[PDB]
């Protein structure tokens, strides 16, 4: 017999399946003998200590900044002072150097939130002695000469001695649940074009510059013995907190600046000498 | 990877860790490395296919610093902002990758001519763009798609787009993501270990195409290298919130 | 772990590490990198014949060349670097019995342990970082900073306290085996004797007091925790 098929359905034709998404469904055709065969990860596979998320990379400690602390530095003096924004290191100048892991990966997202962790390693010995105060300042910032303004915020006083390192969680205290990135979502300028006001006026967005600052002031002046150095360097590490969050994938704010060469055809393009 | 909590010997009191913002705005989490690598990157934007050649070669490798544009260098067919994509930035941290890649190819046509996409396994070379294989001047009688290799056809009149998944047909355990200098003439077998093969597009008549790339479902990365030395000038091309 | 009161021989609360016919003591605490795995499963496929270990020879401590750190040295400066195993065969400690199996076998898998001992005085100060980069051939000049070192498996050395550092290095290579030796008859198409790089870098410059010493020294020691050799051949001189 050859009976008629009365079954039918309305359809909406699309060219690709799950093109925008990182997961879900795919209409990908395997270039294989067996169409459902896949790569084996029985022996060779990702090692368990390797990061699985961008948040895992953000949990790696990275050296952000350094500053000197000497016996000449009078009490109340700012040893360190920065806007602690993981979007941009500077708002008013170019950056070039080794950016921290948490800053690198945060540069890929339009939004960030959660506490930021700092660690201050004092490159000293047992004969160095002094006290500093670390302060997280929000909304309103303190004068350079007014230590009392810094003392009125969220502070941690560290007595330098036998212990030469101190940890500091910077609280997330803002009017919004997340903060948008100060870097651009998309920047088509590739050849260091001389900027004008018309270029800025036709930008992708407006930079919401952070007023949150972290400062380090002298409490007790550094008083080392005559036999050792009078000045020491302090290494400032940074990473995302345990509840650090990222969202809204965008154009990367940072890009490699060292040993960048585009690929050529090997061996056609003059490899045979 | 070294977290560095090892070095953190201080055990004094600290402020609260609080509560995560993950899930508050939406459940669309975008932190997974695999999820970031599985969304597509534009390689070639409206590039010509010419039937005088064997075909347009695409080397099977993920986006990275290898395909990064630098102001002043010679003009290539590649997209200039490949190096500034999220997944390129991620791949700059991992020098090993294993598994399949997926290539979305769109032919700028509505004609009934078939355009063939042939997979070449790891042969040891690394090329891209239009090439005359063995420098001949005729390839219609000896097409690459009819030599024996695995091939798929696009028929633009039906569908101008396709998504093809290329296997990990190589000798090595891992594929090398990047080198310090991509144009350096070093040990020739090591030179070719940055790819796992090629994808060759051959037309009937002259026509343009666009090419995207992403990671497959069966895909892994390893050999964490950490962040490199970088530069930015994003600040300069935007106004602040105080005019 | 805890110091004691002074006696005839000072504070006698030292620890030590004994491996084969070699012992290394330590006066203060040590920092140790995480024990992380190597590639396993490919060994039985890559080599049809069984692989061999020579623990008595390879798993002993062997010192290599001395490293000098000066006050002139800036952050990010390379104090020393080692392409392994190459540099432990034909550059450093060439007459070591650790190198004997590399003469005859052409292939191998190698997991290492590297101990670093510093000796700066109590009126000095500074920070040094040692890190490992797996499968580094033609990628030594990128991701090669102090920041990349802090991300990768590493150890940190304070130059005043003289804390010891132990870097545990697994075998993470894009092939099943690494080639041990180049030869005139062998191919030049494959770079042999390099599956990883070790970097010793200044994290914070060395500083000293008035009329103090302008330098101090660090000594690395190496050993194989798991050295499996494959493909027996006639013995050759190393490089």
């Amino acid at each position: 017999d050859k009976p008629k098929d009365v079954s039918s359905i309305t359809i909406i034709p699309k060219p690709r399946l799950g093109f925008p998404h990182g997961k879900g469904k795919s209409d990908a055709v395997a270039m294989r003998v067996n169409p459902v065969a896949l790569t084996s990860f029985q022996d060779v596979s990702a090692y368990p200590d390797e990061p699985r998320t961008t948040l895992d990379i953000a949990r790696i400690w990275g050296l952000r900044s350094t500053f000197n602390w000497g016996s000449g530095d009078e009490h109340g003096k700012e040893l360190f002072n920065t806007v602690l924004d993981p979007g941009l290191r500077f708002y008013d100048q170019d950056y070039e150097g080794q950016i921290t892991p948490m800053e690198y990966v945060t540069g890929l997202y339009n939004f960030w939130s959660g506490p930021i962790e700092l660690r201050f390693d004092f490159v000293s010995n047992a004969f160095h002695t002094g006290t500093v105060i670390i302060s997280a300042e929000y909304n309103r910032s303190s004068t350079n000469t007014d230590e009392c303004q810094s003392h009125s915020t969220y502070t941690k006083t560290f007595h330098l001695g036998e212990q030469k390192s101190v940890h500091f969680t910077v609280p997330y205290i803002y009017d919004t649940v997340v903060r948008r990135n100060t870097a651009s979502a998309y920047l088509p300028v590739t050849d260091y074009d001389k900027v004008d006001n018309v270029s800025r006026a036709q930008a992708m967005g407006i930079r919401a510059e952070s007023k949150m600052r972290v400062k380090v002031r002298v409490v007790n002046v550094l008083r080392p013995v005559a036999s050792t150095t009078s000045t020491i360097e302090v290494l400032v590490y940074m990473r995302g907190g345990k509840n650090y969050a990222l969202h809204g994938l965008k154009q990367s704010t940072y890009w490699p600046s060292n040993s960048v060469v585009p690929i050529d055809s090997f061996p056609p393009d003059g490899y045979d000498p | 990877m070294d977290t560095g909590a090892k070095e953190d010997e201080d055990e004094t009191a600290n402020f609260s860790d609080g509560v995560t913002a993950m899930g508050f705005q939406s459940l669309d989490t975008q932190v997974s490395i695999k999820d970031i690598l599985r969304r597509p990157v534009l390689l070639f934007n409206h590039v010509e296919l010419d039937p005088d050649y064997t075909g347009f070669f695409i080397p099977i490798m993920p986006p990275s610093r290898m395909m990064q544009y630098k102001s002043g260098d010679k003009e290539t067919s590649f997209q200039r902002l490949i190096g500034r994509t999220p997944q390129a930035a991620i791949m700059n941290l991992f020098r090993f990758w294993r598994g399949s890649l997926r290539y979305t190819i769109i032919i700028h046509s509505t004609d009934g001519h078939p355009i063939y996409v042939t997979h070449v396994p790891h042969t040891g070379n690394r090329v891209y763009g239009l090439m005359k294989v063995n420098n001949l001047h005729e390839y219609t009688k000896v097409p690459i798609f009819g030599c024996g290799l695995t091939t798929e056809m696009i028929i633009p009149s039906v569908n101008p787009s396709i998504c093809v998944e290329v296997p990990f047909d190589t000798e090595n355990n891992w594929a090398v993501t990047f080198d310090e200098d991509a144009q350096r003439n070093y040990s020739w077998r090591d030179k070719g270990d940055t790819v796992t093969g090629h994808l060759v597009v051959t037309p009937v008549v002259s026509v343009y195409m666009s090419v995207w790339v992403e990671a497959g479902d069966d895909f892994e990365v390893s050999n964490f290298y950490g962040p490199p030395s970088v530069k930015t000038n994003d600040w300069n091309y935007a106004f602040s919130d105080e005019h | 772990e805890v110091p004691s009161k002074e006696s005839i021989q000072g504070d006698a609360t030292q620890q030590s590490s004994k491996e084969e016919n070699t012992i290394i003591t330590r006066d203060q605490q040590q920092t140790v990198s995480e024990n992380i795995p190597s590639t396993v499963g490919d060994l039985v496929i890559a080599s049809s014949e069984p692989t061999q270990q020579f623990r008595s020879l390879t798993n002993r401590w062997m010192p290599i060349n001395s490293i000098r750190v000066t006050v002139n040295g800036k952050r990010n400066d390379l104090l020393a670097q080692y392409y392994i195993p190459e540099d432990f065969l034909s550059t450093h400690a060439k007459c070591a019995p650790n190198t004997i199996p590399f003469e005859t076998y052409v292939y191998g898998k190698y997991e290492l342990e590297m101990k670093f001992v510093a000796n700066g005085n109590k009126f000095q100060c500074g920070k040094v970082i040692i890190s490992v980069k797996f499968d580094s051939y033609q990628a030594d000049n990128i991701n090669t900073g102090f920041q990349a070192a802090l991300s990768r498996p590493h150890i940190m050395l304070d130059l005043s306290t003289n804390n010891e550092g132990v870097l545990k290095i697994p075998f993470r290579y894009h092939r099943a085996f690494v080639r041990n030796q180049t030869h005139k008859t062998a191919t030049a198409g494959v770079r042999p004797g390099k599956f990883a790089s070790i970097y010793v870098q200044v994290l914070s410059p060395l500083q000293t007091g008035e009329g103090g010493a302008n330098d101090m020294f660090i000594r690395p020691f190496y050993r194989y925790t798991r050295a499996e050799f494959a493909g027996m051949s006639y013995k050759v001189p190393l490089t």
Partner: peptide, 26 residues
């Protein structure tokens, strides 16, 4: 010619890469 092809003799080893002896590369 293309200067990326071959590394200068004073900084490099026989395998056309920076020598381990050459510390100043950084």
């Amino acid at each position: 010619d293309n200067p990326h092809r071959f590394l200068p003799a004073n900084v490099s080893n026989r395998w056309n890469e920076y020598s381990s002896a050459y510390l100043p590369r950084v």
